[PDB]
């Protein structure tokens with residue numbers, strides 16, 4: 310019945326996006342209860358970003374210097390503090406659209422939806438993964454900082470990402486909602502290079518299961534393998550090593566399809582060694598690694614959010 | 616700065632989704648003002664779908680047979696009528712979350728976002744295109760009928776698609792919001808085959824412009840071509856013929872990049888004739904055709920919706 314790169318419905322998060330301006334700089338904030346979260350680099354000018362001393366720059370800012378606007382209405386800022394790389398602006402009004410929510414720090418390999426925003430206004434929604442090198446491959450222009458990534462379980466939004474930086478190579482870095490960067494990145498305009506962009510093996514396997522469920526089966530073969538043998542191949546192709554935990558996580562998709570995990574690993578092994586020979590899998594000409602096992606079960610089972 | 620398959624924010628549409636049950640069949644409806652729109656096959660049993668006489672089946676239905684539920688609240692049905700392949704259920708309460716909206720019948724080659732829903736509850740959002748054969752390549756399970764596709768211009772939702780049918784080949788067919796199918800498809804479980812899935816040439820060119828803007832430039836070459844020469848190649852590869860209207864639509868992306876449209880056509884020609892030689896463009900190993908010129912400008916310029 311089809312398999313698409315699918316984001317979570319964005320309405321619960323749209324209702325939390327605001328605009329934050331400090332001096333000359335405008336970016337997005339996230340309004341939950343009576344706190345607005347935004348990147349701490351809102352206080353910087355373009356020149357400040359080369360070598361910013363955030364504590365010193367913040368001394369010169371007062372509550373009334375943070376202009377916070379939710380659509381056309383202005384919010385009153387009654388306190389401010391810095392937590393790691395985020396600012397928390399306490400406002401005098403709780404967001405009436407605050408969904409049930411949690412702050413989660415995700416693991417590399419996990420996926421989430423991004424609501425790209427500008428001037429506090431949502432522009433679009435797309436699905437991302439936290440890469441093993443702790444970058445994300447997003448779509449962010451100037452003004453998009455403070456846009457967030459999130460997952461939804463039924464009625465609860467788990468926020469996991471806030472956007473802060475574009476590296477010189479065009480990939481993206483940011484923090485969790487406690488303001489701690491993913492990976493080694495810092496909010497300074499400096500030479501920061503990403504490490505190896507390794508492929509998320511367990512996700513590729515999940516997507517191959519999704520393909521079989523939908524009738525793209527040409528890559529199934531007569532072979533099997535072992536974890537250690539497979540991983541010799543994973544290593545050569547800059548794939549994450551597959552572990553027994555990963556095998557266990559794939560158990561449900563294995564049970565539903567009747568294809569043993571290690572047999573699917575043998576299919577992936579052949580695909581890595583031989584390529585796809587000009588064929589496609591679920592409309593892709595490369596091996597997709599930004600669907601988790603949970604994403605596949607969810608999309609193949611129609612789980613909804615209330 | 617990155618280029619992603621991006622859907623519109625879904626919140627305005629989430630607020631319109633309801634559940635409609637008639638007898639044993641449950642699917643989704645769209646609640647705008649005091650009307651709920653849903654597929655007319657809600658009145659059918661599984662057996663009825665082989666040879667349904669909708670007018671005869673509807674004679675046996677009254678207002679109280681259509682159970683309409685918006686979240687946990689029940690809506691009172693005060694009238695019903697069939698328009699083409701949709702039912703319009705008049706309810707006694709206008710949807711307080713009705714956004715500004717229009718009904719549009721899109722052209723093949725145009726893109727839109729789908730809010731996949733089950734039992735009236737949103738599951739996910741993704742971007743689709745109306746294919747030249749009038750199918751869409753979606754992700755729809757049993758229960759997803761009545762999910763809608765839409766575009767947003769600033770504050771106005773233009774609804775263009777309602778989901779009705781999965782063909783035996785796994786692609787999807789549906790109607791506009793006046794209930795007229797796209798293409799030749801009918802709401803009957805019969806032998807319906809899609810025609811040739813031609814590639815949307817103007818969209819491929821737009822995406823190549825997007826690639827250049829983002830620094831994927833390896834496919835630029837020293838050549839040019841003409842519309843007629845290019846189209847000889849398009850035809851061989853089952854690409855839509857490129858017209859002067861398409862060239863004109865690409866004008867802005869041509870102006871911004873300084874790459875003449877026909878020079879980009881020569882790049883595409885070489886890509887069609889030689890393939891990508893194991894390289895990628897914007898993270899894809901095939902030529903992507905579900906971004907329109909407007910989608911590229913929008914995403915590259917950060918247009919937002921209020």
Ligand SMILES: O=c1[nH]c(=O)n([C@H]2CCCO2)cc1F
Nearest residue numbers: 341342407408409410411412
């Ligand atoms: O840190 C937190 N504080 C909160 O008050 N909530 C409540 C507020 C609404 C739903 O959850 C959640 C958190 F994660």
Ligand SMILES: O=c1[nH]c(=O)n([C@H]2CCCO2)cc1F
Nearest residue numbers: 647648713714715716717718
């Ligand atoms: O057919 C239509 N009828 C309407 O009342 N509207 C109004 C109602 C809210 C915004 O638009 C739009 C239509 F497209």
